Amino acid sequence: CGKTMLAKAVAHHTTAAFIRVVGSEFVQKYLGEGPRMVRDVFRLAKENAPAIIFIDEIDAIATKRFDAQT
Amino acid sequence: LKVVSSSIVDKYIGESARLIREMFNYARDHQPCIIFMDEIDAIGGRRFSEGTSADREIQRTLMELLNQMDGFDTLHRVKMIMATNRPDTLDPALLRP
Amino acid sequence: KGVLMYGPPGTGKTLLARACAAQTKATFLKLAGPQLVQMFIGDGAKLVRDAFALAKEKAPSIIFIDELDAIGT
Amino acid sequence: LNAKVRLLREELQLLQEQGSYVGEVVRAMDKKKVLVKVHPEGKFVVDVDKNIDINDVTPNCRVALRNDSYTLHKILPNKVDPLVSLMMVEKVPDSTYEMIGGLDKQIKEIKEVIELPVKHPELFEALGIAQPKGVLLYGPPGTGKTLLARAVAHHTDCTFIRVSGSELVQKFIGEGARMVRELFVMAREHAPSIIFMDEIDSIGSSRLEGGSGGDSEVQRTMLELLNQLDGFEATKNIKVIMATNRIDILDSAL
Amino acid sequence: LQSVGQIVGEVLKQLTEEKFIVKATNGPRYVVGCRRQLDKSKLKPGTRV
Amino acid sequence: TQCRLKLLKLERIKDYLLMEEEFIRNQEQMKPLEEKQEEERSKVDDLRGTPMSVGTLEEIIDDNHAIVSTSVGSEHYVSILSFVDKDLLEPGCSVLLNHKVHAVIGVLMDDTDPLVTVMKVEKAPQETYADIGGLDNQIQEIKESVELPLTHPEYYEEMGIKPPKGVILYGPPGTGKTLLAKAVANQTSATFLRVVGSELIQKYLGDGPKLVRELFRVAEEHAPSIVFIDEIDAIGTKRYDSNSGGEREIQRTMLELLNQLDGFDSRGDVKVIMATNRIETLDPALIRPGRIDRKIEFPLPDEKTKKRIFQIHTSRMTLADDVTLDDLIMAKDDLSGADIKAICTEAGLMALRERRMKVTNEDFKKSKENVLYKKQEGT
Amino acid sequence: EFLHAQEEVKRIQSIPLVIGQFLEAVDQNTAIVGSTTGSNYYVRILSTIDRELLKPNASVALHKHSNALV
Amino acid sequence: DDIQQLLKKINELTGIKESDTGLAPPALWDLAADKQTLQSEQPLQVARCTKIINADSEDPKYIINVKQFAKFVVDLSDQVAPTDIEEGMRVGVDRNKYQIHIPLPPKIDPTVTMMQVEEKPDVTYSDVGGCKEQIEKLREVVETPLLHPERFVNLGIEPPKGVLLFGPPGTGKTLCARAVANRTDACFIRVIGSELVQKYVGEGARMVRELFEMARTKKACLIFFDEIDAIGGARFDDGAGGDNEVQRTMLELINQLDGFDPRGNIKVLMATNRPDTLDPALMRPGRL
């Protein structure tokens, strides 16, 4: 419909910091490095206020199910 | 690039997203470029919203692929030809005009 | 490229590949259908690719897959 | 001045020990040995330094740990309890009786059912009636069924546990299958407590099918388990509240 | 047999004029120094070293 | 009598033992025997070393060597050291390896189960039989199936007949199945496990049989035990979506229960008590004679029985004088001892809205009219 | 010589350092950090450091093999 | 009081508690453990061979795949003849110089399967009635070929392998097997139908696979699949992969009693009560 359409516009006129992250960049190979990757993107947004953070897809991040054994 | 979709799927704690992310990097530099993907059905399932870890694990690499086609970082001289024998199973957002 | 053998059970499908792989002497690669289903993503894909690559190193080879019902529809 | 500068010249040598691992005490042995779980690794049974009593060690508190011999160097300051934390991952934002208004009649009734049996248990033992546990609210979504429940627990002064089953809580609590009484293990430690449901179908009639009773497990057990749960029946501090939209649907067993 | 190997990482972000912040192959990030025979303009957040 | 004629010889056995130990300590190193033993035990904490790494015993090699898995999962063919009870070395057991040498110093710890804290109960259920009113047949076969064989195991042996193995309590809801369960948990002082029939369905496939396996194992470790299964219907009627494979996975869960309830594996001294109110929906093979032996049924109470129940909950109360117990009983009909206690409880509560202690004949009218709409509404 | 000691400290800040993440104070010079090696640590803090740039969730440097927050 | 003095002094001159042993013999064990520290090859870090580069060459090489999951080219043993260690074989190596030393004890994989082995129950063949063909059929095919294998090879036949027991519940399908279980005096490995239903895709099939790997080594076993209906199914397609998991485990069981695999000499009991459900390819002679 124009989700990524409209945020793409809002990222031209925003006249502020605009930190764009891909949904899956948050995962990665090295263990524990996910949490440290998150903390970073907020401590960077914090310093550079005013800022928009825009995650393109939250389907790998906040899913409803979790297998505790894997 | 001739890419059988069953080969870019491996088991290393979210490594299978790298090849898609990578396979695209490679294309941007050497552009012009064609990426062909044979039997896209391997990593282009539906969604599920109930499956096991194996399934939530391919659902990432797909979601990844789907953002390297139309996120912000628009593609320029890159062409991609998918091929399948069952396009009823493909995620509607991968078949989206 | 390859022949299928289908029919009722016990009619002698598995008996013909036994006899085939012992009378020809070529490189005959024994593989059963449920040995390819692994719990770790893609590992079952890797074993198939390895099988065919090990058949090219030893060529001319014969890969007899038993129980194609472990990879349904 | 001499003392100060003496410290700073000596410091450069103090900064050479390889540091210290922070594990957490799992549980103590008797031989002045403690079972400690080193964060990124496995577990180690270890000696304790003499200066820290074996009585200050307590299962679940955090401990330093020497970078070589692994003795209990010093007890760290930060105890870690999940029910204290988990509840902050549900963000159910507690309010006051000043916020729920236009109910009144309802407010006064739950006070006779939850406030009195917690505060004055002597009134039911004196009257000669058993304390009530199950309390079912119900009305169209967004009429303050949760808003009141949050409050009642705030003035009574009990821990408030939103139960939802989400796997996110099961990292804080334990293992799915056995996880029922496993909740009562955390309620009992912080008793008095009000375990709280949220019977779905506050969004549709697809929550009343395809599965056939999805959140009516969190109470056909909790409640069946809450007549004969350990020796807590003597002092009954653990109530339970569920809230639907339609009172006709409940499973007849409820 | 006299050569050795060098660890491949990336330049995450230049810090001062001489200290960089590079990430290893796995994770262990470092504040590191650098050969003064390198064009400090090519090192920039993103490149491999 | 004879028992001290036995003592007079037991002591001599010990006095002799004292001769040997008292002389061989001083022959050892002119010191007490526990002081030489303590020289050794401190020296064993030199061997043992500190720290002690927990691990997993994967397999034993007869040669007093064993392949263990440290935290990392790396396996090591180590040696089984001094001061180890090799009879505490089963697979899956936690062992104490040397942090440095990696050799099993032993399983010197009481490895815990968090499933027994759920299944077992350290109860004191107030309700004893004598608080179960007027259901008296029910109160007994049970005693002949559970409590009596533990009190008087000489009757069954003298007759020459095995005691009956398991019971099913079944009837209309409310009649007193779980109340009988409370009664017998109280008394027998066997370890009393309790699992609701619903808890035998959980999200992930396959766990059904696994939870069922580990429930009996717990009850076997603690024999003599009682394993009550409250509402075994819920396994086979209500479902929850969470489970995969649907009804087929429900079956394999049941087939596991069904085996480890009879099966092949030579168990013993674990009574079983299955409550239910839908008995007609149970796989017969589950309740096959020789799997469960006695099917007590709980009919709705009579009229004179229904009066002993309504007379038992009111006993802790103070009723006003205008209360006629016999008018409120007959007023309604087809009451379960759950409905009776529900009318008593409500009315007593109406007295607590007024700040009194006399349940009046009108408190019971309001109550009886709020449990009847309760039974009439929400049906 | 107070100045000398401040010039003499420096050596501990010798490159190369291991970036880690500060977690919380303990005493008036000891804190809990977490290397990007995965582990946690309870280390001395180097005297003479802006004591309260330290808190939020700030990036810090630890001294390779001793882990001192320098 | 005096028997209590007995226990008092017993403890005063032995003393045990939450201590790992009885402490009576292990005091000398201690002095053998000081020889276990000198045992420097120990600890030995365990790995598995995967590929022998050279064998006829003067210098055999191997490719060890250890548990840190990095792979090494290594030397041969420092004494053990290089004929003993083939590829696949699990083998222990030294941790300093990854030198292969001690061949194993392979197929660790058996962890759950370990526990299926049996320790003789308490029922005998007299405690069973209806001793017609019923029990004389079964002895004939499962007990007699293991006690007197000379009379089947002199005639020149080969007795039949598997035996299916089926009947209404409570008619002695298990009893008649509790029976043969002890009197047979040959390795007895019963699996409970439901314990082969696992959580992860094709873990069930692994279970079966490991089960026969273990039974082929131990020369002459019984396997007694009790109450197979789980993993006893019958192939069928409909909808979304119904029982596709369990079904595939069965194909593995089928496949290992009839594939190419000659197989050692292991008999197999299967006691259902619902034979109507078993897959035809599981039921026909030459497997049952």
Ligand SMILES: Nc1ncnc2c1ncn2[C@@H]1O[C@H](COP(=O)(O)OP(=O)(O)OP(=O)(O)O)[C@@H](O)[C@H]1O
């Ligand atoms: N209102 C509109 N006006 C003009 N063009 C539109 C409009 N909506 C969508 N488009 C066009 O259609 C495309 C689809 O929109 P967009 O790419 O933002 O999809 P999206 O909603 O981000 O999809 P996804 O769900 O895959 O993230 C745009 O790239 C743009 O070309």
Ligand SMILES: Nc1ncnc2c1ncn2[C@@H]1O[C@H](COP(=O)(O)OP(=O)(O)OP(=O)(O)O)[C@@H](O)[C@H]1O
């Ligand atoms: N045509 C035949 N001639 C001689 N013997 C036969 C013949 N067919 C079957 N047999 C005998 O029957 C046995 C079983 O046949 P076989 O194992 O080949 O069945 P299959 O069709 O491979 O099994 P499935 O359909 O169950 O995978 C053989 O071991 C063989 O001794």
Ligand SMILES: Nc1ncnc2c1ncn2[C@@H]1O[C@H](COP(=O)(O)OP(=O)(O)OP(=O)(O)O)[C@@H](O)[C@H]1O
């Ligand atoms: N025959 C009875 N005599 C005395 N009290 C009774 C009787 N029947 C029921 N009660 C009272 O009702 C309460 C609940 O009854 P109980 O738990 O026995 O119901 P149930 O038959 O187990 O119901 P369900 O089918 O839901 O399990 C008991 O705690 C008890 O006080």
Ligand SMILES: Nc1ncnc2c1ncn2[C@@H]1O[C@H](COP(=O)(O)OP(=O)(O)OP(=O)(O)O)[C@@H](O)[C@H]1O
């Ligand atoms: N022929 C028999 N002789 C003596 N006892 C028998 C006989 N048949 C059955 N029984 C009795 O039945 C009891 C249970 O039988 P068993 O469990 O072996 O039946 P089953 O076929 O295994 O049933 P299920 O399908 O429920 O496992 C035995 O303990 C035994 O006492």
Ligand SMILES: Nc1ncnc2c1ncn2[C@@H]1O[C@H](COP(=O)(O)OP(=O)(O)O)[C@@H](O)[C@H]1O
């Ligand atoms: N009686 C009330 N007084 C004040 N706010 C109310 C009232 N009823 C509803 N609300 C508002 O609506 C929100 C949702 O109501 P609530 O009952 O908590 O949700 P639910 O639909 O789950 O019952 C409340 O958090 C509150 O902001």
Ligand SMILES: [Mg+2]
């Ligand atoms: Mg988009």
Ligand SMILES: [Mg+2]
């Ligand atoms: Mg065949």
Ligand SMILES: [Mg+2]
């Ligand atoms: Mg009940």
Ligand SMILES: [Mg+2]
């Ligand atoms: Mg049986």
